[PDB]
PDB file of C-alpha atoms and ligand atoms in Angstrom:
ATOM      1  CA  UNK A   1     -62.615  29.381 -42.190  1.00 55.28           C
ATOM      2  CA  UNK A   2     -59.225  30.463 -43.311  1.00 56.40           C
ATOM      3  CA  UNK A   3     -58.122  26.722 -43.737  1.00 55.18           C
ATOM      4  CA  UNK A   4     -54.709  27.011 -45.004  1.00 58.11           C
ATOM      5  CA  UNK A   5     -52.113  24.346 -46.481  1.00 57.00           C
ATOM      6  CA  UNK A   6     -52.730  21.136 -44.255  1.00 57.34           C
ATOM      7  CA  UNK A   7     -50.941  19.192 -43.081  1.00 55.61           C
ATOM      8  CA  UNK A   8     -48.154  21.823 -42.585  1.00 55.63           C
ATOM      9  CA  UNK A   9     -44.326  21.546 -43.876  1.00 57.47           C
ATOM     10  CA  UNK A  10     -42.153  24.270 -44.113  1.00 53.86           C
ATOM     11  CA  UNK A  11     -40.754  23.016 -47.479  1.00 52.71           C
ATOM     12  CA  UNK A  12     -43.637  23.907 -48.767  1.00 52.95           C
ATOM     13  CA  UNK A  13     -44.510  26.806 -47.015  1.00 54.95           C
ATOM     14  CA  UNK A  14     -41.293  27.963 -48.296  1.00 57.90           C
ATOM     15  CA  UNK A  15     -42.307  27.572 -51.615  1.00 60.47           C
ATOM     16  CA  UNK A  16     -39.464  24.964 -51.781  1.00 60.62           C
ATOM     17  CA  UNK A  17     -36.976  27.579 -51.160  1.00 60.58           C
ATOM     18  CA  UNK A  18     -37.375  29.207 -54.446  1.00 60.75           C
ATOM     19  CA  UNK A  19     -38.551  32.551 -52.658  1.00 58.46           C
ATOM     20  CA  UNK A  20     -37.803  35.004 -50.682  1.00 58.23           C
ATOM     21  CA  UNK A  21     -39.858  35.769 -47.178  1.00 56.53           C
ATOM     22  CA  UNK A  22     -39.916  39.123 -45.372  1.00 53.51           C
ATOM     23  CA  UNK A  23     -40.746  39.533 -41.461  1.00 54.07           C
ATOM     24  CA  UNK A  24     -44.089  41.502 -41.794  1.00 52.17           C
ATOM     25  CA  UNK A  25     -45.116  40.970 -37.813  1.00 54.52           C
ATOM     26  CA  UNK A  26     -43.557  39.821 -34.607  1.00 55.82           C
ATOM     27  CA  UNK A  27     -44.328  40.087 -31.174  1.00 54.06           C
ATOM     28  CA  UNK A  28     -40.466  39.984 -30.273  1.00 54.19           C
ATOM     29  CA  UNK A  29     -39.464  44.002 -28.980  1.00 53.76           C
ATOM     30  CA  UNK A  30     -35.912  42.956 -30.220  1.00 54.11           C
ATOM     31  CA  UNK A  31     -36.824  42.240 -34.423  1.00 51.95           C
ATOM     32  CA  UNK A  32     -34.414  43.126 -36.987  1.00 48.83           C
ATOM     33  CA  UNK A  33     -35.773  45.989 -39.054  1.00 50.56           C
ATOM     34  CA  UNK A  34     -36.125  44.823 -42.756  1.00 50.80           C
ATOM     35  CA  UNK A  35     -35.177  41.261 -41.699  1.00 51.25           C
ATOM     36  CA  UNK A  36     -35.434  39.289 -45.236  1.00 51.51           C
ATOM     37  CA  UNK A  37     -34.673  35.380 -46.069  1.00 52.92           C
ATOM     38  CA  UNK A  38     -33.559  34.268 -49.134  1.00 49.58           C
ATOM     39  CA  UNK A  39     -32.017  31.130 -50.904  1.00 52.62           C
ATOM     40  CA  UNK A  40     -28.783  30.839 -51.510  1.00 54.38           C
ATOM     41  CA  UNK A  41     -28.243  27.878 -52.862  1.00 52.69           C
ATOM     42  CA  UNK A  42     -30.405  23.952 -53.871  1.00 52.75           C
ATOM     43  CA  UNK A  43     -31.835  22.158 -51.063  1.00 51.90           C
ATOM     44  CA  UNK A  44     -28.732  20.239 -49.566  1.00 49.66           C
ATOM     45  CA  UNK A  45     -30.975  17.141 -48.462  1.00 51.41           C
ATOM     46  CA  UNK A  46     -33.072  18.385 -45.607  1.00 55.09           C
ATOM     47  CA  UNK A  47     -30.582  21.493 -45.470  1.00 52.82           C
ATOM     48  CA  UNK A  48     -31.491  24.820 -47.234  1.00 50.05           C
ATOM     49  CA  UNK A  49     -29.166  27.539 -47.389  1.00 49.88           C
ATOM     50  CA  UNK A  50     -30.379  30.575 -46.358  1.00 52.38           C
ATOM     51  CA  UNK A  51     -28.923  34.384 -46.198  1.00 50.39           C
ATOM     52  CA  UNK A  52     -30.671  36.873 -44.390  1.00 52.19           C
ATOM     53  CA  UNK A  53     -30.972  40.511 -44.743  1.00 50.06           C
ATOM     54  CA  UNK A  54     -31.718  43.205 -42.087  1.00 51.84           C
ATOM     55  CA  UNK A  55     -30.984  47.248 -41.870  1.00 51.94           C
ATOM     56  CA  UNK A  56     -29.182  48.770 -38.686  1.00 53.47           C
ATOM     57  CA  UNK A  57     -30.102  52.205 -38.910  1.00 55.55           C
ATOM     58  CA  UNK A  58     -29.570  53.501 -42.440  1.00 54.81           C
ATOM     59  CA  UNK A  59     -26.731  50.341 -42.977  1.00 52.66           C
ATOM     60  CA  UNK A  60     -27.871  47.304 -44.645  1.00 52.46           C
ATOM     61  CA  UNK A  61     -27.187  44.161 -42.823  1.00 51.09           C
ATOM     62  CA  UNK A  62     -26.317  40.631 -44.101  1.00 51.10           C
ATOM     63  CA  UNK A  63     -25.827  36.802 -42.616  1.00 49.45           C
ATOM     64  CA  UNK A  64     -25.808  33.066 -43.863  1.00 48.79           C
ATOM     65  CA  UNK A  65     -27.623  30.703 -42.337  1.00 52.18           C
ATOM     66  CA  UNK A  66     -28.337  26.501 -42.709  1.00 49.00           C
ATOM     67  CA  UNK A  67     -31.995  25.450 -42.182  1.00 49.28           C
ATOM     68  CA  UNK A  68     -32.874  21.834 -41.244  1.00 50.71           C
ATOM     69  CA  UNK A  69     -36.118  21.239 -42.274  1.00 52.66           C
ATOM     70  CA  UNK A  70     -38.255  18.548 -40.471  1.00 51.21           C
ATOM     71  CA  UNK A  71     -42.211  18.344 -41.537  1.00 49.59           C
ATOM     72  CA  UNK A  72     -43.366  21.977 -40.200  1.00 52.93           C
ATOM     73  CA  UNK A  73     -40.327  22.445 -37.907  1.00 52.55           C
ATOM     74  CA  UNK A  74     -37.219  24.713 -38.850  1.00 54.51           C
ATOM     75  CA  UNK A  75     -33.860  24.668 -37.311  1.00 55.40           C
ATOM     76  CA  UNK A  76     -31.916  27.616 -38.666  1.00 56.53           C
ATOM     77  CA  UNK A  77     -28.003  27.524 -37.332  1.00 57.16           C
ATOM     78  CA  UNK A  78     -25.156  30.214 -37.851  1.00 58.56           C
ATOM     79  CA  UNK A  79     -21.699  29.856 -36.124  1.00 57.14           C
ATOM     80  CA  UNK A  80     -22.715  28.809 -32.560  1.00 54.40           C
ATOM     81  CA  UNK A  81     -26.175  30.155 -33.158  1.00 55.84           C
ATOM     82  CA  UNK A  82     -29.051  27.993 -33.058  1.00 53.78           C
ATOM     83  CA  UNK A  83     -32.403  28.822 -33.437  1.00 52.58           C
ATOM     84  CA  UNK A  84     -35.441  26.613 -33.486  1.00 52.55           C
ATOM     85  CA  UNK A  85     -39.040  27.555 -35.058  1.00 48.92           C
ATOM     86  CA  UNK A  86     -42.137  25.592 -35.851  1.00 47.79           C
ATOM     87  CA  UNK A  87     -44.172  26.593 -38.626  1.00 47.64           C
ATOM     88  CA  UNK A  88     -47.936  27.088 -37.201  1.00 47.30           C
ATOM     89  CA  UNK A  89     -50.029  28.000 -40.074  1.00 48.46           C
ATOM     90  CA  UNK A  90     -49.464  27.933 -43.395  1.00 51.10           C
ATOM     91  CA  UNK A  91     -51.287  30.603 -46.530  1.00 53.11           C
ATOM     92  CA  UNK A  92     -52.996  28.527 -48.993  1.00 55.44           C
ATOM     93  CA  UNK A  93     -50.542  29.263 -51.402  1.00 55.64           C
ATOM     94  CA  UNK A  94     -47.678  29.259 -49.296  1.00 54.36           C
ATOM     95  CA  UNK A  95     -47.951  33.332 -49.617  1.00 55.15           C
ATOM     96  CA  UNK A  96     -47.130  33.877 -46.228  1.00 56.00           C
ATOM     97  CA  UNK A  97     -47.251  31.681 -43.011  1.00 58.20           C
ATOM     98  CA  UNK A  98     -46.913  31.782 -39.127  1.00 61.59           C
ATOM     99  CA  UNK A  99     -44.115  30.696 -37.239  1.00 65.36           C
ATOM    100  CA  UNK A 100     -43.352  29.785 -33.506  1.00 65.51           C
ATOM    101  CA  UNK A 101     -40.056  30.695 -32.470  1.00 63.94           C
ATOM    102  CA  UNK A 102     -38.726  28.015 -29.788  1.00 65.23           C
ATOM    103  CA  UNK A 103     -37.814  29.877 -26.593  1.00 61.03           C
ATOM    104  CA  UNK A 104     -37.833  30.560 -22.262  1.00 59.31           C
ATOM    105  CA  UNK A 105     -40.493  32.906 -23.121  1.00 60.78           C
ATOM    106  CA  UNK A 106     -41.871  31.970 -26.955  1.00 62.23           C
ATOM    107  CA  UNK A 107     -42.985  34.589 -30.025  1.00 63.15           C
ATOM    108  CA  UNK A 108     -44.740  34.428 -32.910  1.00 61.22           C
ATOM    109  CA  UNK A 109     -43.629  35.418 -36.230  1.00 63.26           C
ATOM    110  CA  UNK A 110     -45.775  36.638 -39.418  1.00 60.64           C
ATOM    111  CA  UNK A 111     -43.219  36.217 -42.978  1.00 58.55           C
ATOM    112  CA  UNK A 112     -44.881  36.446 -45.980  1.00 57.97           C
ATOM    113  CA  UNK A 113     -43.284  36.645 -50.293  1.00 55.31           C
ATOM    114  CA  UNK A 114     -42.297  40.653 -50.578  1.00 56.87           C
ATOM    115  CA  UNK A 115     -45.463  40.953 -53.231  1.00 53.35           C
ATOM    116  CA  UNK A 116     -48.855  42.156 -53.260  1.00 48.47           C
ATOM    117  CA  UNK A 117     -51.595  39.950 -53.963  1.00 46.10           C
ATOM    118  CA  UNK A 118     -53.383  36.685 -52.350  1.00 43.62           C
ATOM    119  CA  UNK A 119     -54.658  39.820 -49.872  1.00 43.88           C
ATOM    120  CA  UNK A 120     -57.506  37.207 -47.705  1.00 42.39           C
ATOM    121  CA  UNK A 121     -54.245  34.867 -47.173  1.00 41.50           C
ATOM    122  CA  UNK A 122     -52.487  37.860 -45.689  1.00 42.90           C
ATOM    123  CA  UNK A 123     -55.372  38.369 -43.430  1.00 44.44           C
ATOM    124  CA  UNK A 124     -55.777  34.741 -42.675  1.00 43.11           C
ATOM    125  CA  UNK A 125     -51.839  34.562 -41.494  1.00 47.75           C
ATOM    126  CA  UNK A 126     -52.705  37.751 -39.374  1.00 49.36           C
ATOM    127  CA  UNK A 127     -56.004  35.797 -37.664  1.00 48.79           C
ATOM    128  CA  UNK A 128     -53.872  33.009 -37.312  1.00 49.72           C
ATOM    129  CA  UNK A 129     -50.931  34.863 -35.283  1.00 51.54           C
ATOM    130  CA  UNK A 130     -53.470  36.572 -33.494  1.00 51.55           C
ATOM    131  CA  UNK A 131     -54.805  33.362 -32.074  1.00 54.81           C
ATOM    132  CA  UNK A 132     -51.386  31.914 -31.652  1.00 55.86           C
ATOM    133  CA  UNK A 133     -50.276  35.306 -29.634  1.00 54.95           C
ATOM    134  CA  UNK A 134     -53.350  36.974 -28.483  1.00 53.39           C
ATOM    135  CA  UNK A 135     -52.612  39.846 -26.113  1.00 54.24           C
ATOM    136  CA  UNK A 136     -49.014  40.366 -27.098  1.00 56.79           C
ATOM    137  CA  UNK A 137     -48.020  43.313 -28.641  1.00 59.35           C
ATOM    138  CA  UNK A 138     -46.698  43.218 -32.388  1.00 58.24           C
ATOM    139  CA  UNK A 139     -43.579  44.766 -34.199  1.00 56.96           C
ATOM    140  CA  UNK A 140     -44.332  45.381 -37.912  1.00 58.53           C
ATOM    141  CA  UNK A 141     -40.096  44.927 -38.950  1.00 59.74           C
ATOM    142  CA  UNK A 142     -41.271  45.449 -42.817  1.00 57.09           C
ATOM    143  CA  UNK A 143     -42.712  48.851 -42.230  1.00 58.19           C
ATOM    144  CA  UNK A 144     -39.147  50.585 -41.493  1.00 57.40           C
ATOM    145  CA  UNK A 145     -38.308  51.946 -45.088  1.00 56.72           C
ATOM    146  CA  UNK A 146     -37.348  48.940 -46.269  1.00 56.51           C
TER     147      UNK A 146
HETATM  148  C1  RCL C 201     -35.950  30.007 -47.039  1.00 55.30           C
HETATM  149  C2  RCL C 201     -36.646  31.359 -47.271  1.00 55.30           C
HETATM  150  C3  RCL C 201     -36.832  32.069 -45.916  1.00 55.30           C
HETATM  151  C4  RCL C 201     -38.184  31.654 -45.310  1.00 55.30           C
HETATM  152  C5  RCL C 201     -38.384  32.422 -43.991  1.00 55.30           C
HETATM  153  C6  RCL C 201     -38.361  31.420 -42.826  1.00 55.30           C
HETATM  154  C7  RCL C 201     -39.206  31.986 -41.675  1.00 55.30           C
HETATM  155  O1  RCL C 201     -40.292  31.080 -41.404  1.00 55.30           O
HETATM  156  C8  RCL C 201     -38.318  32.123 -40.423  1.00 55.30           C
HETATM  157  C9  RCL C 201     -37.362  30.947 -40.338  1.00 55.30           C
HETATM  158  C10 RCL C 201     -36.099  31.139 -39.938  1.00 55.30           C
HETATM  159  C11 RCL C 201     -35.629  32.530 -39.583  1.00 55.30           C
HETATM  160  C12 RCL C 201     -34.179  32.472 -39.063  1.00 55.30           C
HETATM  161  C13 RCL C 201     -33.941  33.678 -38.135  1.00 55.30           C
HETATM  162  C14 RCL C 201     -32.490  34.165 -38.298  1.00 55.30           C
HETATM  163  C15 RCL C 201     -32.352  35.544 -37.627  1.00 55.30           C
HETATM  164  C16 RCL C 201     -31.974  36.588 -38.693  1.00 55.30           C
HETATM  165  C17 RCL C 201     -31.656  37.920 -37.992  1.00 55.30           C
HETATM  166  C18 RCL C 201     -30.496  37.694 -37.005  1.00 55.30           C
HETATM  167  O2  RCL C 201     -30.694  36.988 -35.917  1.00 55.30           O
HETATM  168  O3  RCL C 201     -29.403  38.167 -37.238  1.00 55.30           O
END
């Protein structure tokens, strides 16, 4: 069935901010090689601070970021930048979990905890994404000698 956590919150999907999630698959041409989200700090009420991670080349990468977190929706800002996602699926475990990202022209995003393990949830997320964005072509931003 691969019935994950229902009903969905990103809180919990984010294992209440007390992990880190790596981009593993994205159907966006334009994803951030090694893109990585971590806590950075207690959740400010419905506020999490967030820094992520990314390589350019052979040059690590870094940013802060403030998610507002709303049930299953995610509203990650930075300076002037604002970007909205909606948390689709969700692992079991909160292992990994599939996201929307808000847009003209939407994608779909795959993050997951960097660890092995909880294998069938991987491969639930990745029937779940493939639902969400059949026929689009995926980016594995992970798999870049991370
Ligand atoms: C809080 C631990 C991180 C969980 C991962 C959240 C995941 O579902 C995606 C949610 C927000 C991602 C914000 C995207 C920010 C872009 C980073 C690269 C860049 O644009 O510079």
């Amino acid at each position: 069935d691969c019935t994950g956590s229902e009903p969905v919150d990103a809180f919990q999907a984010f294992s209440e901010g007390k992990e880190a999630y790596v981009l593993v698959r994205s159907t966006d041409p334009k994803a951030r090689d090694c893109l990585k989200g971590e806590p950075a700090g207690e959740k400010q009420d419905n506020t999490l601070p967030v820094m992520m991670t990314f390589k350019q080349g052979t040059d690590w990468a870094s940013t802060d970021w403030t998610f507002t977190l709303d049930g299953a929706k995610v509203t990650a800002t930075l300076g002037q930048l604002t970007q909205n996602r909606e948390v689709v699926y969700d692992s079991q475990s909160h292992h990994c979990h599939v996201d929307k990202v808000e847009k003209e022209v939407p994608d779909y995003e795959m993050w997951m905890l960097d660890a092995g393990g909880l294998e069938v949830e991987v491969e639930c997320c990745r029937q779940k994404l493939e639902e969400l964005a059949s026929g689009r072509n995926q980016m594995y931003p992970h798999l870049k000698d991370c």
